[PDB]
Every structure is written in C-alpha cells, then in structure tokens.
Amino acid sequence: VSSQDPVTGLYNRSHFLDLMDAAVQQAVTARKPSTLAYIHLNGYPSLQADHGLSGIDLLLGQLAGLMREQFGEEADLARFGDSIFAALFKGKTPEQAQAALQRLLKKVENHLFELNGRSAQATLSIGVAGLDEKTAKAQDVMNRAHRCADDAARKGGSQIKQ
Q1: What is the dihedral of CA 20, 68, 9, 1, to 10 degrees?
Q2: In Å, how far are 70, 137, 141 from 158, measured between CA atoms?
Q3: Rounded to whole angstroms, how far apart are CA atoms 21 and 41?
Q4: CATH number assigned to the domain comprising residue 43
Q5: Which of 16, 58, 66, 157 sits between 20 and 30 A of 111, alpha carbons compared?
C-alpha cells in the first residue's frame, strides 16, 4: 500500500508513526534526542468553508512545499490529518530545533496563497515535544506535542508551544 499522501506529497500518518517508533527506541537505548513537531493549520474550518475541497487541496500542497523548503533534510514530514502536519527532527533537542520552527512559522504567516484565482493567508499552531532517554512510551511523546498544539491553536495566530 502507498505510503504517500497524494494531495500534499508527504508521507502518511501510518508511515510517520513507524518513523516515530524507531526514533523513540533510538532515544531510550542510544540516547539520541529527537524532536516531534505537531502542526495545526490555523482556522482550517473557515478555509474549507470558503475554499472547499479544491481550495484546500492546493493550500495543503503549497503548505507542505514550504515545510520541505524550510526544514530540508533536517525533518521527516507527514500529513497527519486533514489540517494537521507532523515533523520529526531526528538528532535534535527541541531547543536545537526551535530555529527552524520559528522560521517556518513566519514563512507561512507572511505567505500569500493563490487558491483557484482566490487569495488567502494562514498561520500555524505548533506543538513541540522532545524524544529523550527519560521517555517512557512513544505515545506519551505524541500526546504531549498534541496537547501543546491544541493549546497553541486555542490562542489564535502563529503559535509555538513547547
């Protein structure tokens, strides 16, 4: 079965979750820190309402292309859900990864999207969680970055919550 999201071009959640499992094992046996970024597209409901399936398909594809650009080789990129992206920064502490997360955040906030003639703007809410040897369950890492991202999007605008 294909491991890629045909809309965005990024790998799928299933694929990412395997990469996740492996990065945690590395973190608790080899003690190599990784960072998990949990990315919300802010105001997705309103963008879908105004632009519909076609509009958002284009947005997500552009949004991913900016993530590929801003993170390059440093991160593994997934389409986690409809309005949710995920990034794993293998070998980097959250501290070490903040720079690139800050860079993307602004790239998006200051980016104008062309959607079927129409024009739109968007910000992201990023929940960040580290992978370390004090990790107890791979699922705990997902949870923390999840919860942080949800708290991030609860505030409105471009947001990073570590």
Answers
A1: -30
A2: 16, 29, 22
A3: 25
A4: 3.30.70.270
A5: 16
- Cβ burial of 104 (10 Å; 0-12, 13-18, 19+) is buried
CA separation for the pair 142, 138 (Å, rounded): 7
CA distance 40 to 140: 19
The domain tally of the chain equals: 1
Pairing verdict, β 84-90 and 76-79: antiparallel
Q: Angle, to 10 degrees, between the axis of helix 44-71 and the axis of helix 94-109?
A: 120
Q: H or E stretch including 78? A: strand 76-79
Which residue from 160, 23, 21, 26 is spatially nearest to 95, judged by alpha carbons? Answer: 160
Q: Give the resolution in Å.
A: 2.0
Q: How far apart are CA 109 and CA 36, in angstroms?
A: 21
Question: Rounded to 5 degrees, what are φ and ψ at 148?
Answer: -65, -45
Whole domain around residue 132: which residue ranges? 1-162
- List the chain gaps (C–N > 2.5 A) by preceding residue: none
CA distances from 118 to 7, 107, 108, 113, 123 (A): 19, 20, 17, 8, 17
Amino acid identity of residue 34, one-letter, is S
